[PDB]
Amino acid sequence: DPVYAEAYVHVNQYDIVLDVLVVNQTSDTLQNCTLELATLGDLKLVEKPSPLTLAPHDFANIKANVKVASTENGIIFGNIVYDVSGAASDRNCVVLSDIHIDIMDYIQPATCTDAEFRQMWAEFEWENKVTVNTNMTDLNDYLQHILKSTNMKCLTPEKALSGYCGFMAANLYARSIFGEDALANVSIEKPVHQGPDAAVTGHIRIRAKSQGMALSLGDKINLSQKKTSL
Amino acid sequence: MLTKFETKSARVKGLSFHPKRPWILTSLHNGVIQLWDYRMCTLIDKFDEHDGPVRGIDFHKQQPLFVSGGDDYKIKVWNYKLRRCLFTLLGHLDYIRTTFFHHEYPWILSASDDQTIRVWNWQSRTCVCVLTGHNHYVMCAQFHPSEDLVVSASLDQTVRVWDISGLRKKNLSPGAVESDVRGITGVDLFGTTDAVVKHVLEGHDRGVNWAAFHPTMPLIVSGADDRQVKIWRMNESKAWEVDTCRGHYNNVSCAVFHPRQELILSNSEDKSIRVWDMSKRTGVQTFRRDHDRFWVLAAHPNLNLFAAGHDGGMIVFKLERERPAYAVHGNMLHYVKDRFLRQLDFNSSKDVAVMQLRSGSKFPVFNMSYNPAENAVLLCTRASNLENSTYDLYTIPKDADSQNPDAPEGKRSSGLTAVWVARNRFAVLDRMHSLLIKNLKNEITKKIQVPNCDEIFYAGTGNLLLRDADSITLFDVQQKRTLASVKISKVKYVIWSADMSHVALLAKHAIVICNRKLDALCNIHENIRVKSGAWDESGVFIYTTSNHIKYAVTTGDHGIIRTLDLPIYVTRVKGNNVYCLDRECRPRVLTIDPTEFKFKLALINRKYDEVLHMVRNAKLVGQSIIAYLQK
Numbered sequence: 098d099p100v101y102a103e104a105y106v107h108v109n110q111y112d113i114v115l116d117v118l119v120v121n122q123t124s125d126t127l128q129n130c131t132l133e134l135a136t137l138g139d140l141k142l143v144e145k146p147s148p149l150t151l152a153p154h155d156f157a158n159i160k161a162n163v164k165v166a167s168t169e170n171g172i173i174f175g176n177i178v179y180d181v182s183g184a185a186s187d188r189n190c191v192v193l194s195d196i197h198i199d200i201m202d203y204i205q206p207a208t209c210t211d212a213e214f215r216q217m218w219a220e221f222e223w224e225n226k227v228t229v230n231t232n233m234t235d236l237n238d239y240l241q242h243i244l245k246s247t248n249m250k251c252l253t254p255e256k257a258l259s260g261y262c263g264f265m266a267a268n269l270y271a272r273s274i275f276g277e278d279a280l281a282n283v284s285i286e287k288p289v290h291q292g293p294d295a296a297v298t299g300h301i302r303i304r305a306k307s308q309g310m311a312l313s314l315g316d317k318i319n320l321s322q323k324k325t326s327l
Numbered sequence: 328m329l330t331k332f333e334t335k336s337a338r339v340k341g342l343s344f345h346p347k348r349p350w351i352l353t354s355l356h357n358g359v360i361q362l363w364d365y366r367m368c369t370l371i372d373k374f375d376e377h378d379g380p381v382r383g384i385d386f387h388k389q390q391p392l393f394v395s396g397g398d399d400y401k402i403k404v405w406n407y408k409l410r411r412c413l414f415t416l417l418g419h420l421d422y423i424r425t426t427f428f429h430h431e432y433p434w435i436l437s438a439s440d441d442q443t444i445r446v447w448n449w450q451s452r453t454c455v456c457v458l459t460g461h462n463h464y465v466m467c468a469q470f471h472p473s474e475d476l477v478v479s480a481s482l483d484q485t486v487r488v489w490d491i492s493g494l495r496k497k498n499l500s501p502g503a504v505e506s507d508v509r510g511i512t513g514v515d516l517f518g519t520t521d522a523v524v525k526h527v528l529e530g531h532d533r534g535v536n537w538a539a540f541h542p543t544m545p546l547i548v549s550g551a552d553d554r555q556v557k558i559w560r561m562n563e564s565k566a567w568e569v570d571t572c573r574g575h576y577n578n579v580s581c582a583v584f585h586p587r588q589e590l591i592l593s594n595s596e597d598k599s600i601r602v603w604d605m606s607k608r609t610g611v612q613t614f615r616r617d618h619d620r621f622w623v624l625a626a627h628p629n630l631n632l633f634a635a636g637h638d639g640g641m642i643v644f645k646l647e648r649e650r651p652a653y654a655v656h657g658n659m660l661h662y663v664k665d666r667f668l669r670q671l672d673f674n675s676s677k678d679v680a681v682m683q684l685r686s687g688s689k690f691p692v693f694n695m696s697y698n699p700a701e702n703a704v705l706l707c708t709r710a711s712n713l714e715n716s717t718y719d720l721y722t723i724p725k726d727a728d729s730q731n732p733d734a735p736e737g738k739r740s741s742g743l744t745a746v747w748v749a750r751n752r753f754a755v756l757d758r759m760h761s762l763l764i765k766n767l768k769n770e771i772t773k774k775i776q777v778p779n780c781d782e783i784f785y786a787g788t789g790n791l792l793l794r795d796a797d798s799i800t801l802f803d804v805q806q807k808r809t810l811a812s813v814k815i816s817k818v819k820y821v822i823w824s825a826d827m828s829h830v831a832l833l834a835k836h837a838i839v840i841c842n843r844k845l846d847a848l849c850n851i852h853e854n855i856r857v858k859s860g861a862w863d864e865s866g867v868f869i870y871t872t873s874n875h876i877k878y879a880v881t882t883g884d885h886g887i888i889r890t891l892d893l894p895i896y897v898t899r900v901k902g903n904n905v906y907c908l909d910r911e912c913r914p915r916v917l918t919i920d921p922t923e924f925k926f927k928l929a930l931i932n933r934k935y936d937e938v939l940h941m942v943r944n945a946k947l948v949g950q951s952i953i954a955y956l957q958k
Contacts, residue, residue, distance in 0.1 A: 098892065101875075101890040101891075101892075103874055103875045103887075103890055103945075103948045104873070104874075104948065105873075105949025105950075106949060107949050107950070116947060116948060116949050118945075188390075189893075191874075191893060192367070194367065325850075326837075326849070326851055326853070327852065327853065327854070
């Protein structure tokens with residue numbers, strides 16, 4: 098419509114913030130509908146610019162701050178239905194459920210003593226694993242990339258050698274914003290001429306408390322793993 | 328195609344589908360009224376209207392509101408949306424089956440299951456109407472053709488049809504010839520629910536479960552409290568119309584008309600839904616899937632969805648011809664529905680299914696292919712698996728039931744499917760229920776060729792050959808030696824830039840962009856298992872992006888031309904008069920506004936004039952500087 102509203106999400110530092118362009122290229126501060134607040138996850142949405150005019154030929158920035166540490170809603174991965182309403186110069190609108198709400202980001206790296214670790218590794222919520230196998234790179238650059246992407250930790254090296262092969266299994270740990278600790282041992286082949294690694298066939302073993310997020314994390318990482326057309 | 332969601336529970340007497348929404352509002356005699364605006368597989372609200380049972384559900388007529396009835400006997404209208412009660416009166420000695428909203432002075436009609444129904448003025452306070460002619464326990468109350476003319480179905484073993492007035496019931500008339508309501512060979516009985524000879528129709532059939540009307544018409548389609556659900560037409564009034572609708576085992580609680588479909592859907596109690604015609608009529612088949620107890624069936628007056636209601640519970644199933652056929656003629660898109668009718672180019676208000684002399688999403692398609700001309704199409708109909716079907720090929724100047732065999736933009740013949748194949752002029756035709764090759768220089772083509780008989784894949788589906796080859800395999804008109812196959816894959820269609828030479832590729836999920844033949848230019852993927860993105864010609868990448876519609880890329884450019892309008896998908900590009908699609912609705916004709924093309928060229932020549940001139944000015948939407956304006 099003249100009124101075209103375009104919007105995307107910007108998550109700028111904790112705060113997932115809503116860029117909205119409602120552009121009302123309308124022929125007037127056309128009447129506007131209705132909007133509703135809610136508890137969200139460890140967030141709650143929390144602002145609406147008050148008016149409801151769709152000012153003529155006019156462009157507007159409508160900001161929604163979201164509250165990023167509260168409102169539990171357990172509708173995982175978000176993907177929760179959201180409403181913009183048809184309630185005034187509007188007969189309809191958008192009701193939307195979100196998608197676009199993923200993990201790789203959330204968790205931060207976190208750390209451990211290795212013996213205890215091992216013991217723990219085994220000990221943890223075993224229940225998820227996903228496989229590493231396939232890419233576009235060596236796990237040097239590739240590993241770094243993935244690491245940065247998820248913002249997460251590989252705890253320690255043994256020099257055995259991530260180079261000549263290595264035939265290295267890398268142990269990774271991370272802790273998030275709402276505090277889950279997740280453990281990995283992924284054991285991986287690694288690039289190098291007619292030696293081995295341009296796939297893996299390494300297994301990524303994922304432990305996160307619910308299997309459902311945990312495996313999903315293994316996936317998420319799987320998405321993360323490579324670089325291709327989303 | 329899919330039954331999106333399904334748990335059997337609810338013991339359901341009354342039912343309605345949202346003519347506007349894909350809601351189902353459901354009345355249980357659990358005492359429950361529920362609105363679930365069915366779309367997001369979520370109930371908005373749920374009120375068990377009273378301790379006692381709930382029989383009734385009807386529309387207000389507006390957009391999203393319920394008017395509801397319980398054994399309370401009360402007419403409530405509560406808006407889900409506004410979660411509030413509109414004006415309130417209770418009910419007589421039984422529940423409320425139908426309601427209608429009117430407004431000289433915002434004025435109201437209420438239809439009821441007992442005694443009377445009263446029509447009330449809260450403005451310049453006078454009487455529009457009084458209806459007596461009901462007694463107790465109305466199964467299915469109905470607005471007629473004339474909406475404010477009506478029929479009712481009763482557990483008092485009558486049917487009432489009433490005449491209303493603006494000062495209570497009356498009609499003036501004196502011209503007719505005979506009557507079908509009652510006047511020649513056959514006809515069914517009066518019942519008693521009222522006392523005026525409009526027609527009280529006999530609702531005895533151990534009582535009548537449902538009554539359903541024929542808009543301008545007086546045919547009724549019925550649910551009945553007999554195995555016999557007996558069909559009568561009062562727009563005929565046949566003999567062997569003393570039809571008892573028969574299961575195998577007992578009942579026929581209901582059997583119903585679908586507004587659109589010239590059909591009857593029956594449902595019953597041997598664990599069944601039974602399938603019936605009504606276009607040429609006959610018991611097609613019976614289908615069994617539990618619930619030896621039901622009382623409602625429904626097909627949406629939105630027609631979105633279709634569903635059947637039962638005691639033990641309920642099911643909703645969703646239709647699609649997931650992915651479905653096309654042709655291009657100047658600045659116009661042709662579609663063949665997955666679900667949904669035409670939408671075969673241009674638009675005007677909310678959604679418009681393209682109805683034209685190039686009927687696309689309509690026919691019983693096996694395959695549709697442009698026979699290029701801005702004036703021709705080739706079409707197979709009777710679709711399906713047979714020995715062979717018919718193809719009637721039609722002229723854009725005017726299509727037909729079958730166009731002229733005389734005309735070669737009209738020809739029809741027999742043949743099962745017709746299919747493209749690679750190295751572009753050979754074709755497949757099936758004209759046996761298996762491999763005929765079709766090959767012509769012309770693409771006004773209908774050619775028959777058994778040579779190239781080569782099964783080892785028996786009649787099925789592919790289109791550059793891919794009986795799930797997972798390859799597009801190139802050939803001539805017989806050979807028993809491959810020319811070659813390339814490993815790449817299809818939506819099971821290859822996309823040509825208009826006619827028959829598009830190295831722009833479809834893939835079912837993902838689509839790949841090539842220039843002609845395999846040159847993988849870039850490869851597309853998204854992950855929504857639904858929509859589209861469009862090419863103007865060979866590889867012009869349009870992508871749809873929310874309420875924003877975007878050029879993925881040009882020259883070295885990327886751009887937002889114009890912005891979308893709720894979901895749309897780019898299908899592809901018909902000229903400058905732009906065309907867009909969400910799948911088959913939620914549509915555009917569009918004044919353009921390119922972005923980018925101009926731009927990387929423009930840019931490449933430093934040129935701004937344009938942008939500027941447009942005064943086009945974003946850089947953020949989330950961001951928007953990030954094509955290369957960031958870089």
